[PDB]
Coordinates of C-alpha atoms in Angstrom, one line a residue:
Chain I
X10 CA 0.0 0.0 0.0
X11 CA 1.3 3.5 -0.9
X12 CA 0.6 5.9 2.0
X13 CA 1.7 8.9 0.0
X14 CA -1.1 8.2 -2.5
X15 CA -3.5 7.8 0.4
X16 CA -2.6 11.3 1.6
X17 CA -3.2 12.7 -1.9
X18 CA -6.6 10.9 -2.0
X19 CA -7.7 12.3 1.4
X20 CA -6.7 15.9 0.5
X21 CA -8.3 15.7 -2.9
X22 CA -11.5 15.2 -0.9
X23 CA -11.3 17.3 2.2
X24 CA -10.4 15.0 5.2
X25 CA -8.4 15.9 8.4
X26 CA -6.9 12.5 9.5
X27 CA -3.6 10.7 9.9
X28 CA -3.3 7.3 8.2
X29 CA -2.7 5.1 11.2
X30 CA -2.1 1.7 9.4
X31 CA -2.7 -0.3 6.2
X32 CA -3.3 -4.1 6.1
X33 CA -3.1 -6.1 2.9
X34 CA -6.5 -7.8 2.3
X35 CA -5.6 -9.3 -1.2
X36 CA -7.2 -8.9 -4.6
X37 CA -5.5 -5.5 -4.7
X38 CA -7.4 -4.2 -1.6
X39 CA -6.2 -3.2 1.9
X40 CA -7.8 -2.2 5.2
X41 CA -7.0 1.4 6.1
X42 CA -7.4 3.2 9.5
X43 CA -7.9 6.9 9.3
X44 CA -7.7 8.8 12.6
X45 CA -9.4 12.3 12.8
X46 CA -9.1 14.2 16.1
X47 CA -7.6 11.0 17.7
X48 CA -10.9 9.1 16.7
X49 CA -10.0 6.0 14.5
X50 CA -12.3 4.8 11.7
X51 CA -12.0 1.7 9.4
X52 CA -11.9 1.9 5.6
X53 CA -11.2 -0.1 2.5
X54 CA -8.9 1.2 -0.2
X55 CA -7.2 0.1 -3.4
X56 CA -3.5 -0.9 -2.9
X57 CA -2.4 2.0 -5.1
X58 CA -4.0 4.4 -2.6
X59 CA -6.0 6.1 -5.3
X60 CA -9.5 5.0 -4.0
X61 CA -10.9 4.9 -0.4
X62 CA -14.5 3.6 0.4
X63 CA -16.5 1.7 3.1
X64 CA -18.7 -1.1 2.0
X65 CA -22.2 -1.7 3.4
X66 CA -22.5 -4.9 1.3
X67 CA -19.3 -6.9 0.6
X68 CA -19.2 -10.3 -1.2
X69 CA -16.0 -12.3 -1.3
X70 CA -15.1 -15.5 -3.1
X71 CA -13.0 -16.6 -0.1
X72 CA -15.0 -16.9 3.2
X73 CA -11.7 -16.1 5.2
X74 CA -11.5 -12.7 3.4
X75 CA -15.1 -11.8 4.5
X76 CA -14.5 -12.8 8.1
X77 CA -11.2 -10.8 8.2
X78 CA -13.0 -7.6 7.2
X79 CA -15.6 -8.3 9.8
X80 CA -12.9 -8.9 12.4
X81 CA -11.1 -5.6 11.4
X82 CA -14.3 -3.5 12.0
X83 CA -15.2 -5.5 15.2
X84 CA -11.7 -5.2 16.8
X85 CA -11.1 -1.5 16.0
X86 CA -14.5 -0.6 17.5
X87 CA -13.6 -2.6 20.6
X88 CA -10.1 -1.0 20.9
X89 CA -11.5 2.4 20.5
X90 CA -14.1 1.8 23.1
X91 CA -11.4 0.7 25.5
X92 CA -9.1 3.6 24.6
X93 CA -11.9 6.2 25.0
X94 CA -12.8 4.5 28.4
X95 CA -9.3 4.7 29.7
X96 CA -8.8 8.3 28.7
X97 CA -12.1 9.3 30.2
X98 CA -11.3 7.7 33.5
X99 CA -8.0 9.6 33.8
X100 CA -9.9 12.8 33.2
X101 CA -12.3 11.8 36.0
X102 CA -9.3 11.2 38.2
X103 CA -7.5 14.5 37.2
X104 CA -10.7 16.6 37.5
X105 CA -11.6 15.1 40.9
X106 CA -12.7 18.5 42.3
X107 CA -15.3 18.9 39.5
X108 CA -16.7 15.4 39.7
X109 CA -19.9 14.7 41.6
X110 CA -19.4 11.5 43.5
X111 CA -22.6 9.7 44.7
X112 CA -22.2 6.6 46.8
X113 CA -24.2 3.5 46.1
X114 CA -27.1 2.7 48.6
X115 CA -25.1 -0.3 49.8
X116 CA -21.2 -0.2 49.9
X117 CA -19.8 -1.0 46.5
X118 CA -16.4 -1.1 44.8
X119 CA -18.0 -0.5 41.4
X120 CA -18.1 2.9 39.8
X121 CA -20.4 4.0 36.9
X122 CA -19.0 7.1 35.1
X123 CA -21.5 9.4 33.4
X124 CA -20.7 12.4 31.1
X125 CA -23.8 14.6 30.8
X126 CA -25.2 17.9 29.6
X127 CA -28.0 19.6 31.5
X128 CA -29.8 20.6 28.3
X129 CA -29.6 17.1 26.6
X130 CA -33.0 15.4 27.0
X131 CA -31.7 11.9 27.4
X132 CA -29.2 13.1 30.1
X133 CA -32.3 14.5 31.8
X134 CA -33.7 11.0 31.5
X135 CA -30.5 9.4 32.8
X136 CA -30.4 11.7 35.8
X137 CA -33.9 10.6 36.7
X138 CA -32.7 7.1 36.9
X139 CA -29.8 8.1 39.2
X140 CA -31.2 6.4 42.3
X141 CA -31.8 3.3 40.2
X142 CA -28.1 3.4 39.1
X143 CA -27.2 3.8 42.8
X144 CA -28.6 0.4 43.8
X145 CA -25.9 -1.2 41.7
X146 CA -22.8 1.0 42.0
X147 CA -21.2 4.3 42.9
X148 CA -21.8 7.1 40.3
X149 CA -19.3 9.7 39.3
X150 CA -20.8 12.5 37.2
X151 CA -19.2 15.1 35.0
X152 CA -21.5 17.7 33.4
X153 CA -20.2 19.4 30.3
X154 CA -21.4 22.3 28.0
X155 CA -21.6 20.4 24.7
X156 CA -24.8 21.8 23.4
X157 CA -24.4 25.6 23.3
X158 CA -24.1 28.6 25.6
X159 CA -26.8 27.6 28.0
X160 CA -25.3 24.2 28.8
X161 CA -21.9 25.9 29.6
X162 CA -23.7 28.3 31.9
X163 CA -25.4 25.5 33.7
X164 CA -22.2 23.4 33.9
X165 CA -20.5 26.5 35.3
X166 CA -23.3 27.0 37.8
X167 CA -23.0 23.4 39.0
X168 CA -19.3 23.8 39.7
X169 CA -19.7 26.7 42.3
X170 CA -22.8 25.2 43.6
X171 CA -21.2 21.8 44.2
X172 CA -21.1 21.3 48.0
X173 CA -19.8 17.7 48.3
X174 CA -23.0 16.8 50.1
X175 CA -24.7 14.1 48.1
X176 CA -28.4 14.8 48.9
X177 CA -27.8 18.6 48.6
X178 CA -25.9 18.2 45.4
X179 CA -28.5 16.0 43.8
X180 CA -31.3 18.4 44.7
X181 CA -29.1 21.2 43.2
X182 CA -28.4 19.3 40.0
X183 CA -32.1 18.5 39.8
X184 CA -33.1 22.2 39.3
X185 CA -30.4 22.7 36.5
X186 CA -31.7 19.5 34.7
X187 CA -35.3 20.9 34.6
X188 CA -36.3 21.3 30.9
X189 CA -36.0 25.0 29.7
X190 CA -34.1 26.1 32.9
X191 CA -31.9 29.2 32.7
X192 CA -28.2 29.2 33.6
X193 CA -27.1 32.0 36.0
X194 CA -24.5 34.3 34.4
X195 CA -20.9 33.8 35.7
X196 CA -17.4 33.1 34.5
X197 CA -17.3 30.0 32.3
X198 CA -13.6 29.3 32.2
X199 CA -13.9 26.2 34.4
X200 CA -16.8 24.7 32.4
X201 CA -15.0 25.2 29.1
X202 CA -11.7 23.7 30.3
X203 CA -13.6 20.8 31.9
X204 CA -15.7 20.4 28.7
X205 CA -12.6 20.6 26.4
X206 CA -10.7 18.1 28.5
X207 CA -13.7 15.7 28.2
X208 CA -13.9 16.2 24.4
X209 CA -10.2 15.4 24.0
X210 CA -10.8 11.8 25.2
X211 CA -13.0 11.2 22.1
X212 CA -16.4 11.6 23.9
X213 CA -18.7 13.4 21.4
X214 CA -22.2 12.5 22.5
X215 CA -24.1 12.8 25.8
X216 CA -25.1 11.0 27.9
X217 CA -21.8 9.0 27.8
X218 CA -21.8 6.1 30.4
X219 CA -19.0 3.7 31.3
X220 CA -20.3 0.7 33.2
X221 CA -18.0 -1.8 35.7
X222 CA -15.9 -4.3 33.7
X223 CA -17.7 -7.6 32.9
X224 CA -16.7 -11.3 31.9
Chain S
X4 CA -11.5 -8.5 -15.7
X5 CA -11.9 -12.3 -14.9
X6 CA -15.6 -12.9 -15.5
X7 CA -15.0 -16.6 -14.8
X8 CA -13.9 -15.7 -11.2
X9 CA -16.9 -13.4 -10.8
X10 CA -19.3 -16.2 -11.6
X11 CA -17.4 -18.6 -9.4
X12 CA -17.5 -15.9 -6.7
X13 CA -21.2 -15.6 -7.1
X14 CA -21.7 -19.3 -6.6
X15 CA -19.6 -19.2 -3.4
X16 CA -22.1 -16.7 -1.8
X17 CA -25.1 -18.4 -3.3
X18 CA -26.1 -15.5 -5.5
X19 CA -28.1 -16.8 -8.5
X20 CA -27.3 -14.0 -10.9
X21 CA -26.0 -13.5 -14.4
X22 CA -22.9 -11.3 -15.0
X23 CA -24.2 -8.8 -17.5
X24 CA -21.2 -6.5 -18.1
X25 CA -17.9 -5.3 -16.6
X26 CA -16.2 -2.0 -17.3
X27 CA -12.8 -1.0 -15.8
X28 CA -12.8 1.9 -13.3
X29 CA -9.1 2.0 -12.5
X30 CA -6.9 1.0 -9.6
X31 CA -7.8 -2.7 -10.2
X32 CA -11.6 -2.1 -9.8
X33 CA -14.4 -2.4 -12.5
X34 CA -18.1 -1.4 -12.6
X35 CA -20.2 -4.6 -12.8
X36 CA -23.9 -5.3 -13.5
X37 CA -25.5 -8.4 -12.0
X38 CA -28.9 -9.6 -13.2
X39 CA -31.2 -11.7 -11.0
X40 CA -34.5 -12.5 -12.7
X41 CA -34.0 -9.7 -15.2
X42 CA -33.4 -7.1 -12.5
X43 CA -30.0 -5.5 -12.9
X44 CA -28.0 -3.9 -10.1
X45 CA -24.7 -1.9 -10.0
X46 CA -21.7 -3.2 -8.0
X47 CA -18.0 -2.7 -7.8
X48 CA -15.5 -5.6 -8.2
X49 CA -11.8 -6.4 -8.1
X50 CA -10.3 -7.3 -11.5
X51 CA -9.5 -10.8 -10.4
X52 CA -13.3 -11.3 -9.7
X53 CA -12.7 -12.5 -6.2
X54 CA -14.5 -9.6 -4.4
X55 CA -17.6 -7.7 -5.1
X56 CA -19.2 -4.9 -3.1
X57 CA -21.4 -1.9 -3.0
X58 CA -19.9 1.4 -1.7
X59 CA -22.2 4.0 0.0
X60 CA -19.2 6.2 0.8
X61 CA -16.7 6.4 -2.1
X62 CA -13.6 8.8 -2.2
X63 CA -11.4 9.0 -5.2
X64 CA -8.1 10.9 -5.8
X65 CA -9.3 11.9 -9.2
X66 CA -12.8 13.3 -8.7
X67 CA -13.9 12.5 -12.3
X68 CA -13.7 8.8 -11.4
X69 CA -16.0 9.4 -8.4
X70 CA -18.5 11.2 -10.7
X71 CA -18.2 8.3 -13.2
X72 CA -19.4 5.9 -10.5
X73 CA -22.4 8.2 -9.9
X74 CA -23.1 8.3 -13.6
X75 CA -23.0 4.5 -13.6
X76 CA -25.5 4.2 -10.8
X77 CA -27.8 6.8 -12.2
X78 CA -27.9 5.4 -15.7
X79 CA -28.6 1.9 -14.5
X80 CA -31.4 3.2 -12.2
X81 CA -33.0 4.9 -15.1
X82 CA -32.8 1.9 -17.5
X83 CA -34.3 -0.3 -14.7
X84 CA -37.2 2.1 -14.1
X85 CA -37.9 2.1 -17.8
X86 CA -37.7 -1.7 -17.9
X87 CA -39.9 -2.0 -14.8
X88 CA -42.5 0.5 -16.1
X89 CA -42.8 -1.4 -19.4
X90 CA -43.4 -4.7 -17.7
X91 CA -45.8 -3.1 -15.2
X92 CA -47.9 -1.5 -18.1
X93 CA -48.2 -5.1 -19.4
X94 CA -49.5 -6.3 -16.0
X95 CA -52.0 -3.5 -15.9
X96 CA -53.4 -4.4 -19.2
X97 CA -53.6 -8.2 -18.4
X98 CA -55.1 -7.5 -14.9
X99 CA -57.7 -5.0 -16.2
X100 CA -60.6 -6.5 -14.2
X101 CA -58.5 -5.8 -11.1
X102 CA -57.6 -2.2 -12.1
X103 CA -59.4 0.8 -10.9
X104 CA -59.6 3.0 -14.0
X105 CA -60.4 6.6 -13.1
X106 CA -61.3 9.0 -15.8
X107 CA -59.6 12.4 -15.7
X108 CA -61.9 15.3 -14.7
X109 CA -62.0 16.4 -18.3
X110 CA -61.1 14.2 -21.3
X111 CA -57.5 13.3 -21.6
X112 CA -55.5 10.7 -23.5
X113 CA -52.6 10.7 -20.9
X114 CA -52.5 8.0 -18.2
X115 CA -50.8 7.8 -14.8
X116 CA -50.3 4.2 -13.4
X117 CA -50.2 3.8 -9.6
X118 CA -49.4 0.7 -7.5
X119 CA -50.5 1.2 -3.9
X120 CA -50.8 -0.5 -0.6
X121 CA -53.6 0.6 1.8
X122 CA -51.4 0.4 4.9
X123 CA -48.5 2.4 3.4
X124 CA -48.4 6.0 5.0
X125 CA -47.3 7.7 1.8
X126 CA -49.9 5.8 -0.2
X127 CA -52.8 7.3 1.8
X128 CA -51.3 10.7 1.1
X129 CA -51.0 9.9 -2.5
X130 CA -54.6 8.8 -2.7
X131 CA -55.7 12.1 -1.1
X132 CA -54.1 13.8 -4.1
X133 CA -56.1 11.7 -6.6
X134 CA -58.4 14.7 -7.4
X135 CA -55.3 16.6 -8.5
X136 CA -53.8 13.7 -10.4
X137 CA -57.2 13.5 -12.3
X138 CA -56.8 17.1 -13.3
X139 CA -53.7 16.1 -15.4
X140 CA -54.5 12.7 -16.7
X141 CA -56.5 9.5 -16.4
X142 CA -55.4 7.2 -13.5
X143 CA -55.0 3.4 -13.4
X144 CA -54.7 2.1 -9.8
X145 CA -53.7 -1.4 -8.7
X146 CA -53.8 -1.9 -4.9
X147 CA -51.6 -4.8 -3.8
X148 CA -51.0 -6.5 -0.4
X149 CA -47.2 -5.8 0.1
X150 CA -47.3 -4.9 3.8
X151 CA -48.8 -7.9 5.7
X152 CA -52.1 -9.6 6.2
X153 CA -54.3 -6.6 6.7
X154 CA -52.9 -5.1 3.5
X155 CA -53.8 -8.3 1.6
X156 CA -57.3 -8.4 3.1
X157 CA -57.9 -4.7 2.2
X158 CA -56.7 -5.5 -1.3
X159 CA -59.2 -8.4 -1.5
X160 CA -62.0 -6.3 -0.1
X161 CA -61.3 -3.6 -2.7
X162 CA -61.4 -6.1 -5.7
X163 CA -64.6 -7.7 -4.5
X164 CA -66.3 -4.3 -3.8
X165 CA -65.1 -2.6 -7.0
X166 CA -68.2 -1.5 -9.0
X167 CA -66.7 0.5 -11.8
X168 CA -68.7 3.6 -10.6
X169 CA -65.9 6.2 -10.2
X170 CA -67.5 8.2 -7.4
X171 CA -68.5 5.2 -5.3
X172 CA -65.2 3.3 -5.8
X173 CA -63.3 6.4 -4.6
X174 CA -65.6 6.6 -1.5
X175 CA -64.9 2.9 -0.9
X176 CA -61.2 3.2 -1.3
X177 CA -61.1 6.2 1.0
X178 CA -62.5 4.0 3.7
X179 CA -59.8 1.4 3.1
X180 CA -57.0 4.0 3.1
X181 CA -57.9 5.2 6.6
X182 CA -55.2 4.0 9.0
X183 CA -57.4 2.5 11.8
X184 CA -59.7 0.7 9.2
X185 CA -59.3 -3.1 9.5
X186 CA -59.3 -5.6 6.5
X187 CA -62.5 -7.8 6.2
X188 CA -61.7 -11.5 6.1
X189 CA -62.3 -13.4 2.7
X190 CA -60.5 -15.4 0.1
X191 CA -57.2 -13.7 -0.8
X192 CA -56.4 -15.8 -3.9
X193 CA -57.2 -13.0 -6.4
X194 CA -55.4 -10.3 -4.4
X195 CA -52.4 -12.7 -3.9
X196 CA -52.2 -13.3 -7.7
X197 CA -52.5 -9.6 -8.3
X198 CA -49.8 -8.8 -5.8
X199 CA -47.4 -11.5 -7.2
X200 CA -47.9 -10.3 -10.8
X201 CA -46.8 -6.8 -9.8
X202 CA -43.9 -8.1 -7.8
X203 CA -42.7 -10.2 -10.8
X204 CA -42.2 -6.9 -12.7
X205 CA -39.6 -5.9 -10.1
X206 CA -41.7 -3.3 -8.2
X207 CA -40.3 -3.4 -4.7
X208 CA -41.8 -0.3 -3.0
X209 CA -45.1 1.6 -3.0
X210 CA -46.4 4.1 -4.1
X211 CA -45.0 3.2 -7.5
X212 CA -46.1 5.7 -10.2
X213 CA -45.6 5.8 -14.0
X214 CA -46.2 9.2 -15.3
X215 CA -46.5 10.2 -18.9
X216 CA -43.7 12.3 -20.1

């Protein structure tokens, strides 16, 4: 595979990614990983690097070739999920002061990590199930301003109003999560740095939830 | 490319098609047409014939090549539509007893052909515009059971209750297109034969409309 031709193909069509790797598939085709903003995606390309595409429907004469492509998509998605999870957990550790920690109803060594935005409706839905999360595990919650100015305001508000008292903090977050609530004007530097740090992991959508390791 | 490999590749994945054509695209790939039961579809394939695929997202260093693939898809889609419409017009004439023929509001020698299913959401809206279709042309309407038992039952009811009186047939169909209406049980053999005849043309989705142009 010629990486130099791959770069020309990506540029000819606007793309902002670094060719991570290329694996020969055969029949003049290779599996290519393109990483934009640290997020890795799988592609197929011709060995000369002149064409890049993804195939919804792929039919191969050899069964082994069909399984290998399936494996490549399956493994990359798993590695990315693991990589995003490890980075997010380090942000939770580094940004400890800005994290709401809610203990499980009964002592637990399991933590559920949640990234949320006050204005996202599903996050509002997730927050209503908080007590039902709490039966199973501890919950660590980071609120980010991903959906516009109002979210950053609310995220900024939560950071000064965070007391470290579970019941008081949940009641306080509850008001911010109210649909069509209004953020109180204040300095938003902390929310932005918190939110940017979270985005750098590869978290793009809220609510983002990491459950306890299984099997 | 190696058309022998392409057939041998088709056997491997149990595709019972005929390799119509192959045209080189570049970079070891060619545009291929595969026909199953006279329906042709566009695919991409390696020159050795060992791999065939459909690409929703395609990026090419030379943009002309990318445009050429779009040209290939569009031209095949138009030829298939023309082929399907010609077979469908033959079905309409063979199944005339089962066709609702609606005269245009004022005399016209143009005809619009419509294949419909009573339970399709877009079909109910298409039927609500029939008065406006009839301002431009005559309309021939076949209602088939493509979306489950209630659709087939409604198709059977319509064929049994068809009078040939335009005003009453439209009032009858209006009832069947209403979403909470339920199909009345009876023999579905005629509706089934009607439905299969339309399907054999290659019609896969409703509403399917042949306009005069």
